[PDB]
Amino acid sequence: FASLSANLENCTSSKWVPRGDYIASNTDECTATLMYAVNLKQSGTVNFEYYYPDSSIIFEFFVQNDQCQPSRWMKTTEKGWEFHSVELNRGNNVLY
Amino acid sequence: THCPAGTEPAVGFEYKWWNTLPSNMETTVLSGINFEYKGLTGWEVAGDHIYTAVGASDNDFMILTLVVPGFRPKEVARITFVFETICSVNCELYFMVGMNSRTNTPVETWKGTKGKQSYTYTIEENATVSFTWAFQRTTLHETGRKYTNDVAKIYSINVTNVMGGVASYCRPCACTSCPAGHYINRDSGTCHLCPSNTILKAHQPYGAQACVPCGPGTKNNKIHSLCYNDCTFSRNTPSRIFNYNFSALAGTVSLAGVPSFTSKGLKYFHHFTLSLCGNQGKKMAVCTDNVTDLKSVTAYVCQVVIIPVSSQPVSLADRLVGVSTDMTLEGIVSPVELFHPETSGIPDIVFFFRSNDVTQSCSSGRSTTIRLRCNPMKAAPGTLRLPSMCSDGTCDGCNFHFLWESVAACPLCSASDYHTFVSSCVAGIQKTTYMWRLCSGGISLPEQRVTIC
Amino acid sequence: NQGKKMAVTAYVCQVVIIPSEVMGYVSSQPVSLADRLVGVSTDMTLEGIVSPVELFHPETSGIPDIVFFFRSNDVTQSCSSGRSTTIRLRCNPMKAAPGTLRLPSMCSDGTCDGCNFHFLWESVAACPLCSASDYHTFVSSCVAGIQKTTYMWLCSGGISLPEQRVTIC
Amino acid sequence: YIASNTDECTATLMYAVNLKQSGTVNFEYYYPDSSIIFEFFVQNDQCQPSSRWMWEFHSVELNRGNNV
Ligand SMILES: *[C@@H]1O[C@H](CO)[C@@H](O[C@@H]2O[C@H](CO)[C@@H](O)[C@H](O)[C@H]2NC(C)=O)[C@H](O)[C@H]1NC(C)=O
Ligand SMILES: *[C@@H]1O[C@H](CO)[C@@H](O)[C@H](O)[C@H]1NC(C)=O
Ligand SMILES: *[C@@H]1O[C@H](CO)[C@@H](O)[C@H](O)[C@H]1NC(C)=O
Ligand SMILES: *[C@@H]1O[C@H](CO)[C@@H](O)[C@H](O)[C@H]1NC(C)=O
Numbered sequence: 097f098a099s100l101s102a103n104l105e106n107c108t109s110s111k112w113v114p115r116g117d118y119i120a121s122n123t124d125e126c127t128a129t130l131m132y133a134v135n136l137k138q139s140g141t142v143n144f145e146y147y148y149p150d151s152s153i154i155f156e157f158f159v160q161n162d163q164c165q166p167s168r169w170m171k172t173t174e175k176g177w178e179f180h181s182v183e184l185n186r187g188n189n190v191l192y
Numbered sequence: 193t194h195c196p197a198g199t200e201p202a203v204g205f206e207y208k209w210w211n212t213l214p215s216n217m218e219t220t221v222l223s224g225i226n227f228e229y230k231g232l233t234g235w236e237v238a239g240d241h242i243y244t245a246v247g248a249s250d251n252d253f254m255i256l257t258l259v260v261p262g263f264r265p266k267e268v269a270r271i272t273f274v275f276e277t278i279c280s281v282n283c284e285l286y287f288m289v290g291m292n293s294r295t296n297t298p299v300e301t302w303k304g305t306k307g308k309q310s311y312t313y314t315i316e317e318n319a320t321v322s323f324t325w326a327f328q329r330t331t332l333h334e335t336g337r338k339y340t341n342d343v344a345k346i347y348s349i350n351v352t353n354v355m356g357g358v359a360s361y362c363r364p365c366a367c368t369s370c371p372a373g374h375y376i377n378r379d380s381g382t383c384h385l386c387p388s389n390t391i392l393k394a395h396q397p398y399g400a401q402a403c404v405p406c407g408p409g410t411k412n413n414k415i416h417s418l419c420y421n422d423c424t425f426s427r428n429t430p431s432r433i434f435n436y437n438f439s440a441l442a443g444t445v446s447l448a449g450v451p452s453f454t455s456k457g458l459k460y461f462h463h464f465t466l467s468l469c470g471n472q473g474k475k476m477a478v479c480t481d482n483v484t485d486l487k488s489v490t491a492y493v494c495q496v497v498i499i500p501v502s503s504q505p506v507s508l509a510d511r512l513v514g515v516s517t518d519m520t521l522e523g524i525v526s527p528v529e530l531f532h533p534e535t536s537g538i539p540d541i542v543f544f545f546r547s548n549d550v551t552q553s554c555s556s557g558r559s560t561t562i563r564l565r566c567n568p569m570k571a572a573p574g575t576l577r578l579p580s581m582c583s584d585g586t587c588d589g590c591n592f593h594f595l596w597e598s599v600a601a602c603p604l605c606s607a608s609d610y611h612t613f614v615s616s617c618v619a620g621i622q623k624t625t626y627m628w629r630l631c632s633g634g635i636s637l638p639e640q641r642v643t644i645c
Numbered sequence: 646n647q648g649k650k651m652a653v654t655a656y657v658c659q660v661v662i663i664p665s666e667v668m669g670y671v672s673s674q675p676v677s678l679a680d681r682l683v684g685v686s687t688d689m690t691l692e693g694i695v696s697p698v699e700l701f702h703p704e705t706s707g708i709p710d711i712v713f714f715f716r717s718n719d720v721t722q723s724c725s726s727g728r729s730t731t732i733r734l735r736c737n738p739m740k741a742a743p744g745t746l747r748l749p750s751m752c753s754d755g756t757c758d759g760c761n762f763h764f765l766w767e768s769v770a771a772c773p774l775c776s777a778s779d780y781h782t783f784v785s786s787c788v789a790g791i792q793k794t795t796y797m798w799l800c801s802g803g804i805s806l807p808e809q810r811v812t813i814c
Numbered sequence: 815y816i817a818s819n820t821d822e823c824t825a826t827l828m829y830a831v832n833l834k835q836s837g838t839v840n841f842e843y844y845y846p847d848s849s850i851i852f853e854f855f856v857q858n859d860q861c862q863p864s865s866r867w868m869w870e871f872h873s874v875e876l877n878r879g880n881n882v
Contacts, residue, residue: 103456103457104457104458105457105458105459106456107456107457116225117226118227124456125454125456125458126456126458147227150297150298151295151297151484169486172295174295174296175229176228176229177227177228
C-alpha cells in the first residue's frame with residue numbers, strides 16, 4: 097500500500113492513517129490517496145467494506161487498468177458498514 | 193377532555209415525563225470502537241427525563257431514534273427540545289434529521305457542558321423525518337466505563353403538525369381555511385380580513401395579533417405571507433419630495449469576491465445572489481447543492497460559498513425589516529464605516545431583510561443589510577461592489593452587507609430641479625433654456641422658445 | 646515611443662494563440678503588421694489604402710471619424726500587394742474608460758479582407774481639442790440691475806470651465 | 815516505419831510491456847517539422863510519471879515495473 101498524500105490546488109501530515117482494525121481518512125481538506133498495485137494473474141473482483149458517515153468528505157474508488165486507462169464516486173452508507181465490489185481484468189490493475 | 197368542535201383538530205407530541213417510553217422512539221447503541229450497531233439500550237428512562245445509559249464503552253454512541261411518517265398540515269413543523277447536559281468533557285449531541293429517509297445529517301451539534309435550553313428546527317417540506325440524538329461521552333478512547341456522569345437530559349419534546357398522533361393540544365379555527373389575507377378567528381365566527389398593508393402569521397391562528405402590519409416603504413402581498421417592495425421609495429424633505437427608484441434592481445446579479453486560501457492550499461470565495469425587490473414578493477434567489485448531484489433556500493439574498501462547488505446554502509432574506517434612508521430600522525444597522533462616502537453626496541439608502549433562521553453563532557438571528565447608492569458616472573444598469581474592508585462580508589458574524597451603485601438609484605427630481613438660465617429682454621431678444629443642475633429620469637429637457645419683447 | 650515599434654517588431658503584432666490550459670501548459674504564427682507608415686488623417690483613403698468602414702458601426706458622436714494606416718513590408722503569395730493594416734479611430738463621450746478597443750462584429754477574426762486587418766478603438770481623448778468659442782454661451786442681459794455670465798460646453802480637455810462673475814449694470 | 819497523424823489531433827501509440835528486468839528502449843524517430851510535437855514518456859507500475867519531449871537515435875531507461 098502506498099499512502100500518497102498531496103495538496104489539491106501543509107496537509108502532508110494528513111493522510112490515510114492505520115487507526116486500528118480499520119484505516120481512517122484525513123478529516124482536513126487534502127487529497128489522501130491509498131493506492132495498491134496488484135498484478136491479477138486471473139480475472140477477479142475486489143471486496144472491501146467502507147464506512148461513509150457524512151457527505152462532507154467524498155470517497156473515490158477507481159481501479160485504473162493495465163494501460164493506465166481509467167461511477168467512481170461511492171454513494172453514502174447508512175446504518176451498517178455496507179459492502180462494495182467491482183470487477184477487475186487480467187491486467188496489472190492498480191487500486192486507488 | 194374533548195377538543196371543542198370550534199377548534200380545529202390538532203394532534204401534537206408532548207412527552208414531559210418518561211414513565212412509559214413512547215412507541216415512536218426506540219433506543220440503539222453504536223459502538224464507538226467498531227462503528228457497528230450493538231443493539232443495546234442506549235437511553236434509560238427515569239420517569240421525568242431520559243439520559244444516556246452506559247454501554248460497553250463511554251465512546252459508544254447512545255442513539256434514541258424517533259420516526260414520524262408524515263406531517264399533518266416553510267415552517268410546517270417546529271420541533272422543540274429541552275436539553276440539559278450534566279456531561280463533563282467531550283460532550284456532543286449529534287441531533288440528526290433525515291429528510292425523506294435520506295442519509296442522516298446533523299443540523300446542530302452542541303459541544304461541551306450546557307444547561308437547559310430550547311432549540312427549534314424547520315421542516316422545509318413534508319416527508320418522512322427521523323430525529324436521532326446521538327451522544328458520545330468521550331471523544332478520546334480509554335479502556336473501561338470510567339465516565340458515567342456524562343448524561344444528557346431531555347425531559348420535554350414538542351412536535352407540531354404530526355400525522356397519526358395523539359391530540360395533546362388543539363389549536364383554534366373559525367372549520368374552513370379562510371382566503372389569503374383573512375385572519376382565522378373563532379370568536380368572530382366568520383372569515384375576517386386583515387387591515388390593508390398587513391401580513392398574517394399562521395403560527396398563531398386565533399385573532400389578528402399574529403397579523404402584523406408591513407414596514408415603511410413596503411406594500412402587502414395578496415397572500416399576506418410576506419411584505420412586498422414597490423421598488424420606488426418616496427420620502428418627504430423640506431425642499432421637495434425625493435422619489436428613489438430601484439425598478440432596475442429587481443433582477444438578480446452574480447458578484448463574488450476574490451478566492452482566499454485556507455490554512456492549507458485550498459481556496460474559496462463567497463458568492464451571493466441578490467434580488468432587491470419586485471416579482472410580487474417572490475424571493476426566488478435560491479442556492480442548490482449541485483456538487484452533491486455530481487438543498488435550496490428561498491430568500492431575496494442567497495448565501496453560498498463556491499470553490500473553483502455549490503455548498504453551504506443558507507437563506508439571508510426571509511423577513512422584511514424595513515426600507516428607508518435612515519441607518520437604523522427596527523434595531524438593525526449597516527456598517528456604513530466600511531462603505532466609502534459616495535461621490536454624489538445625497539443621503540444614502542439602505543434596505544433591510546432579516547432571515548428567520550437562528551443558530552448558535554447568531555443568537556439574534558441572521559439579519560442582512562443592503563446599502564444603496566447612486567453615482568452619476570455609473571452608466572451601467574448596475575454595479576454591485578463588495579466592501580473592501582470585509583471581502584467575505586461575514587466580519588460582523590450575522591450582518592452580510594454589499595454595496596450597489598447605479599444611475600437609477602437617484603431620486604426622481606421634481607419640476608423645479610433643473611437650472612434656469614432664462615435671458616432677459618434687452619435689445620428685443622430673450623432666450624429661455626432649462627437644463628438640470630442628481631436628477632434621475634423625469635420629464636425630458638425643455639426646448640428653448642423665442643418671443644418678441 | 647519615438648517611433649519604436651516594440652509590439653517581429655511592429656506597431657501592430659499578429660499572433661493567433663490557442664488556449665494554454667487546453668494544450669496542457671501557445672504563441673505561434675507571429676507576423677508583423679505595421680512596418681511602414683502610410684499616412685494619418687481623417688480621410689478614408691490615403692495612398693490607395695482604405696478601411697472597411699461598412700463593418701464599423703456609425704459612431705454616436707457623429708464627428709468625422711479618424712483612421713490610421715500602417716503597412717507591413719512583408720509580401721506573401723496570398724497578399725500580392727503586401728500586408729496593409731488599417732486602424733479606425735473613434736471618439737465616444739460615454740467611454741469614461743481610458744480606452745475601449747472593440748473588434749469588428751462582422752469580421753471577428755479581422756482577416757476577412759485577406760490583407761487588411763482592422764480594429765475599432767473608442768476613447769474620450771480621441772475627440773478634437775475644442776477651441777475657445779466652442780463652449781455654449783448663456784450670459785444674462787441687464788434687466789433689473791442684475792446680469793449673469795455662465796459658460797459651459799464633443800470637446801476634449803482644453804481650458805477649464807470659466808466661472809460666473811457679477812457686475813452692476 | 816509508422817507515421818504520426820498530420821492532423822491537429824491527439825493520437826497516442828501505447829505499448830504495455832512487463833519488464834521482468836531493468837532495461838532500455840531504443841527507437842529511431844524522425845522529426846521533419848516542429849508543427850507536430852513529440853512526447854515520449856514511461857509510466858511505472860503504480861500508474862505514475864517516472865525529458866517528456868523529444869534519422870537520429872533515442873533511448874531512455876526503464877524499471878522492473880509493468881512499464882507502459
Ligand atoms: C451547478 O450548476 C453549474 C453546472 O455545471 C455549475 O455552475 C455554472 O457552471 C457554468 C459552466 O462553466 C458557468 O458558466 C456558470 O457561470 C456557473 N454558475 C454560476 C452561478 O457561476 C456548477 O457545477 C454548479 N453551480 C452552482 C452555482 O450551483
Ligand atoms: C510543510 O510540510 C512539511 C511536511 O510534513 C511539514 O513538516 C511542514 O511543517 C509544513 N509547513 C508548514 C505547516 O508551514
Ligand atoms: C408546541 O409549542 C407550541 C407553541 O405555541 C404549542 O402551541 C403546542 O401546543 C406545543 N405542542 C404540544 C404538543 O403541546
Ligand atoms: C407526507 O409524506 C408522506 C410520505 O413521505 C405521506 O405518507 C404523507 O401523506 C405526506 N403528508 C401529506 C401529503 O400531508
